Design a protein around this nucleic acid. Structure first.
Lengths: 551, 103, 95, 97, 78, 93, 105, 83, 97
DNA sequence: ATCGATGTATATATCTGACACGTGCCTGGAGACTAGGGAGTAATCCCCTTGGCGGTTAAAACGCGGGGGACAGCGCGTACGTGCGTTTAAGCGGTGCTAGAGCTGTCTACGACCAATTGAGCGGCCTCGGCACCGGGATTCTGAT
DNA sequence: ATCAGAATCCCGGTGCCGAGGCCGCTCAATTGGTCGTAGACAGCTCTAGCACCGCTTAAACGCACGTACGCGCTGTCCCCCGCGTTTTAACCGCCAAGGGGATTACTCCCTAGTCTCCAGGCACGTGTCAGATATATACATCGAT
């Protein structure tokens, strides 16, 4: 509890800053009189009225015990006006102007009072899909229909359907049973209370995790007064178990950074966090065509691995790169034998120094190619596909100012990586899929490597059925999409035919969270772990690392 | 009155009449003269406070033009405001350039 | 005998509010009078030119506030605008 | 005895910068003002307050000009203000074309 | 009567300005400069009076002639 | 929307003074702004002067003394001569 | 004639000048000789500038008056230079002048 | 996008050409810094006025007339952009 | 080879640049600088290109005048090379700051 | 004082888009009439300016000795100009997106106008104390040894 | 450092006149009511600003070398300064005369306002020639020998 004069003296200047906005302030200076103002339904919408005078009064008469209560009322006033008035209206835009003045005023005042910040924070809104169509989606603030907070429909494709009954999966629900609502909900950030001074701070600002510091949160202010420091965070990236692969990659990266000798470079940590054996099954079209006649294996075994790179930024771990791979060993049947495929990779653009970021991503990929080559994998495979809009390959909710490459830029990026790999004599050469097939004198679809989740298994299903029994347009399909599909020769020619068994020295690593991309995306979504800002990514990394350490 | 109805000390009616007669615009909003009188009053309070301080520093109880000149030139913001104005019987700030002082 | 006006008594009242021990000489009174006149002239002229620029025909408080923000240096302008808004609010509120 | 050249000037500075009384003799300046007004309109009468105002304005202007001249003269590694300094200060101020 | 601005008068004026040692041609140059300034201000004051249909230059006329030239003068009833 | 200007008038004056000379659009704009500036100066000075004399009307006398004040010597003399000649030619008919 | 500008033997518009003298709140009532006088003096000043501008242009062997010629005409004439002492002419340029000391020996 | 350190956009040869127009013959190497400062101190006094006009008329585009007025107010008027 | 003695290319440049009227500060860096300075007063402001051009013209004129007066001071001081104190002295004397 | 290498002006051909003119359209200017007050003008009064005479004394004027600063010359060190090769990014030409300037039509709240009214403020009177002044003392600088 | 020797600040006592308070009134601010429109606001159109991408090439940057200039030093000389003495005319006090500044009353004619009508001026389009640009040449000129 601060002395009421202490609060008044500190906060009143922020309130005056709003008052002295003419004419913007005027609509907010006195309690809304619904009838006088010619608006009867105001209290049907606004259930907790608030205005400057009411706030001034509570402030003058010491009704606030702590400054966030003042901030909450200010924001209640603003949201009341944004709620009742149209986006295009006068009062709405006035309100917006006041809120901007307020945000700028309030932040340094709150910090003067011993707080992390004075900002009002809320999480990004989740994207709502549609059960009506494959990748239909609902837009923020626009109206939609939902059932059991589970089945949602865009206002268009909801009214599309003839009649008054919807079908969810095989049971039938009257339209009247759906909720009509706007996608305008934003969840506030959480606070944690200093156990000594009692100040409430943003959990993400102070990075307090209950598992890491179970004794409780104590702010930096209180710690410094008694010359204390937080107990060490033992749930770090560095303390995750090492592997031969992780070590090899991180040595390559850090040796590169040391050669560059750029100011303010940090050490990179690379960890393999999952390794398990899986199988890809041939889909029904291709299986009817070639498996049932014994021309192709019904399935192919591979090892999947997930790996991540971390850097320390402002004293804290930051996960900035992630990748999953499929590795088809020497025991695997042709056509997949001794091949690696990149399932997906992703990044969060906070790496320092910026001007070595791309270089470092390339070093990770070149190192990985070099490593599997050494094990006796002959060939790498890359599908250059950027994420579609609003999908994330690995990291939930990217920074809005992280641009997503289009296909031509992404293709060139892989080419630049591979060209460096060739000049280092790691990659022998590489070709697009069409040229490679030509060189291999390929004649049938059963000869194409068959990877989990890849383009070619799906397009082959489509092709066989379109042609009513089918390979017919295979060269044409390859030519058409060729720029997107890289085939990378690690071990060339006669040497590729007489190799010893592939023996991976690294053990299996059971981690369900990292068995493919879905589980970590789901976790992140369910726990508001975004990678959309430096501070949120630092929080999300901290939580990810606790999860990886605790199993 | 209106000077009391706003907590002011300068006259609001006089400022309103001056705004009307001086032909500064066709009409004058009712909010303008109050604001203008408040601004004038604040500026006069500032000048008089600084002058009173300077006079007390000079062992005098009555403000004289020299004290006004000193309170204007010493302060920075006011000096910038009243840049090209000369005050009768004002005098000059005491200053001697460093090079001129003896060695 | 003509009845000429001035700002003498008002400056006296302000002085008594800000330094209760202190008197003001007649010449300093004339100087303060001329100073108030000059500042008021500057502000009114600037508000007039604003009103003309925006092709509007009335000098409401907004033009006066903008003229103050234009004529005075930073800190003095901020304080003057604060004072102005406070006075206008107390005027409009009470009656 | 004898004050070494350069200290009576400093004492005069310290004494004159403290006072505010007028430094140009009233009657010579009044006759100068009348002589100058003789050329623009014959038989003009001057309110004494206006002559006082003219004297205050001329004093202020000359004091400012000598201040800026001394700035120039000190900048040129010298100590003695000179007519070129006056003229240069006025040219730089933009007062004279 | 320009010789009415005596040499010690310019000496005192300058000593107020902050000079320490004065040359010998200053006096003449200052006489010239002051004559020019007076010519300008008095011309403007006269013109004002000659407009107002009067034969006595009022202190208000000089104050206005100064305020016009960007040399506003407080203390004479502006 | 019609936008007023002093283009054709300055053009006529130029044709009177230099019968075989044209004026570029940018110089046209410059002159168009200079005329506005001088007119504003003269009118403002006449207004201030008429307020000084406690008069409520701007007649030719004010404009004349305003020209006497603003312009330097020879320009003032010639401009005053032009003004009186024009006002006489006007009142004559 | 009909138009009030023709009666004065002028070229500038007296009606527009009169309207402007009313519309900007320069005084309660505007006289009837003031617009004529003001248009006359405006015309004279414009003619005065355009004379020297055309001369300077003919000096550079050109037919069209460009901002450089106006700058030269304004900065060469002693009197105009004083009336326009604090105005910067866009695209104008400056007067060609080099101090004597800077020249070689 | 946020902006920073654009003051170095006034290159050394730019200030050199400017001075060469003004009639200077030899520029001391310390001028190229000081001048930049001066230029900033000028702009922060024009824009701060122009903006104030714009913020008045309830607009978000600083019009050429606004800059011309901000200049004219400082006794540095500018012919050729409107009036 | 052939090498002009120091001090003549400066004069050639003086003549060449005083003869012409084009702008001297690069347009895009100056535009970015103007936007940077303006962003400090009101975020998300848009600039009419004509206004940026007017700002550039005014800055060019101010700097040219300042360098003119600075060169005049530096010649008054029995020197030839303009220096930062000259710029600052010229602006102090002009009555600006 | 020539030679040569470089930059500058001159003379001519080609092409272009910016300036000069012709036309329709519309609204701002012109013409005729009227009511009203702002200004011109006569008369008066008394303030304030001009003019003058005498004394007194502070300040201007003049002459002299000389110490200190202006100024000229010189030599030293280096910071800046000039030219060249290398590297950066401004400039230009499109290509697209759209926030916001600008215009219009409707409605009402705010300010001008006017009659009645009264107290805030101005003109005039009178008192006393804040400051002008003066003499005496204490302290503080400045200059020669 | 150490002394004398002028300058300056401090303190106390005397007096005087200018500021501050008090009183009378009269005219300008206040209050109340009405009427008209300037401006607020919602809605629409569409231009100009912003972003972006690629290609070209002028322009900025770094560097080496040399030299002309900044600057510190030293000597000479004359010219302001401080001071004492002689001269004068500012200054103050007082008186006397009269011009004109200011005020008031009266009358008129100049302008604001209103309506009604039509031509000057602006937007638009179109046509061509002044000037930009490229190329060859004659001359100026700057620097090394």
């Amino acid at each position: 509890i601060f002395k009421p004069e202490e609060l008044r003296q500190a906060l009143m200047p922020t309130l005056e800053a709003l008052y002295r906005q003419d004419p913007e302030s005027l609509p907010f200076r006195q309690p809304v009189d619904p009838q006088l103002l010619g608006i009867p339904d105001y209290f049907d919408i606004v259930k907790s009225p608030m205005d400057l005078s009411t706030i001034k009064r509570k402030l003058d008469t010491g009704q606030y015990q702590e400054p966030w209560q003042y901030v909450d009322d200010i924001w209640l006033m603003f949201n009341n006006a944004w709620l009742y008035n149209r986006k295009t209206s006068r009062v709405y835009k006035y309100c917006s102007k006041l809120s901007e003045v307020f945000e700028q005023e309030i932040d340094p005042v709150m910090q003067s009072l011993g707080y992390c910040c004075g900002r009002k924070l809320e999480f990004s809104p989740q994207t709502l899909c549609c059960y009506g169509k494959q990748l239909c989606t609902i837009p923020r603030d626009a109206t939609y229909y939902s059932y059991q907070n589970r089945y949602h429909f865009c206002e268009k494709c909801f009214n599309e359907i003839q009649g008054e009954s919807v079908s969810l999966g095989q049971t039938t629900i009257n339209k009247e049973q759906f909720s009509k609502r706007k996608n305008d909900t934003l969840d506030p950030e959480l606070f944690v209370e200093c156990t000594e001074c009692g100040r409430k701070m943003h959990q993400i600002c102070v990075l307090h995790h209950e598992i890491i510091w179970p004794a409780g949160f104590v702010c930096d202010g209180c710690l410094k007064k008694s010359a204390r420091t937080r107990k060490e965070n033992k749930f770090s990236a560095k303390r995750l178990p090492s592997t031969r692969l992780g070590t090899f990659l991180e040595n390559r990266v850090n040796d590169f950074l040391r050669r560059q000798n750029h100011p303010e470079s940090g050490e990179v940590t690379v960890r393999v966090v999952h390794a398990s054996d899986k199988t890809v099954e041939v889909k029904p079209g291709m299986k009817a065509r070639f498996v049932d006649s014994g021309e192709m294996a019904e399935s192919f075994p591979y090892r999947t691995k997930a790996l991540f790179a971390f850097e320390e930024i402002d004293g804290v771990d930051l996960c900035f790169f992630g990748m999953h791979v499929q590795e088809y060993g020497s025991d695997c049947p042709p056509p997949n034998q001794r091949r690696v495929y990149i399932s997906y990779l992703d990044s969060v653009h906070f790496f320092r120094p910026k001007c070595l970021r791309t270089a470092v991503y390339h070093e990770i990929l070149i190192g990985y190619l070099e490593y599997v080559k050494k094990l006796g994998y002959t060939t790498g495979h890359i599908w250059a596909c950027p994420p579609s809009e609003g999908d994330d390959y690995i990291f939930h909710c990217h920074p809005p100012d992280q641009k997503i490459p289009k296909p031509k830029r992404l293709q060139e990026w892989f080419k630049k990586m591979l060209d460096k790999a060739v000049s280092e004599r790691i990659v022998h050469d590489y070709k697009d899929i069409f040229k490679q097939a030509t060189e291999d004198r390929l004649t049938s679809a059963k000869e194409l490597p068959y990877f989990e989740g890849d383009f070619w298994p799906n397009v082959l299903e489509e092709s066989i059925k379109e042609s009513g029994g089918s390979s017919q347009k295979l060269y044409a399909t390859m030519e058409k999409h060729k720029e997107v599909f890289f085939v990378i020769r690690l071990i060339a020619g006669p040497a590729a035919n007489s190799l010893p068994p592939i023996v991976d020295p690294d053990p299996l690593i059971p981690c369900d969270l990292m068995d493919g991309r879905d589980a970590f995306l789901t976790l992140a979504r369910d726990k508001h772990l975004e990678f959309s800002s430096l501070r949120r990514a630092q929080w999300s990394t901290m939580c990810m690392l606790v999860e990886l350490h605790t199993q | 009155t209106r000077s009391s109805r706003a907590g002011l000390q300068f006259p609001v009616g006089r400022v309103h009449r001056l705004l009307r007669k001086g032909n500064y615009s066709e009409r004058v909003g009712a909010g303008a003269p109050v604001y203008l009188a408040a601004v004038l009053e604040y500026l006069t309070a500032e000048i008089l406070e600084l002058a009173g301080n300077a006079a007390r520093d000079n062992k005098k109880t009555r403000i004289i033009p020299r004290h006004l000149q000193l309170a204007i030139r010493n302060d920075e913001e006011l000096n910038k405001l009243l840049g090209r104005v000369t005050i009768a019987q004002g005098g000059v700030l005491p200053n001697i350039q460093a090079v001129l002082l003896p060695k | 005998r003509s009845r000429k006006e001035s700002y003498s008594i008002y400056v006296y009242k302000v002085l008594k509010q800000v330094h209760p021990d202190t008197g003001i000489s007649s010449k300093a009174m004339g100087i303060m009078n001329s100073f108030v006149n000059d500042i008021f002239e500057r502000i009114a002229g600037e508000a007039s030119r604003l009103a003309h620029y925006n092709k509007r025909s009335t000098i409401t408080s907004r033009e006066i506030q903008t003229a103050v923000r234009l004529l005075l240096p930073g800190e003095l302008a901020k304080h003057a605008v604060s004072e102005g808004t406070k006075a206008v609010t107390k005027y409009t509120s009470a009656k | 005895h004898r004050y070494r050249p350069g200290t009576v000037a400093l004492r005069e500075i310290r004494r004159y910068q403290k006072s505010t009384e007028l430094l140009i003799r009233k009657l010579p300046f009044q006759r100068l003002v009348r002589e100058i007004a003789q050329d623009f309109k014959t038989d003009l009468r001057f309110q004494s307050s206006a002559v006082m105002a003219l004297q205050e304005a001329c004093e202020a202007y000359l004091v400012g000009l000598f201040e800026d001249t001394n700035l120039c003269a000190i900048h040129a590694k010298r100590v003695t203000i000179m007519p070129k300094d006056i003229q240069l200060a006025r040219r730089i101020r933009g007062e004279r074309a | 009567n320009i010789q009415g601005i005596t040499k010690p008068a310019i000496r005192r004026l300058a000593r107020r300005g902050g000079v320490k040692r004065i040359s010998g041609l200053i006096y003449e140059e200052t006489r010239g400069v002051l004559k020019v300034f007076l010519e300008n201000v008095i011309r403007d004051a006269v013109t004002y009076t000659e407009h107002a249909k009067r034969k006595t230059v009022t202190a208000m006329d000089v104050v206005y002639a100064l305020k016009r030239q960007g040399r506003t003068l407080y203390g004479f009833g502006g």
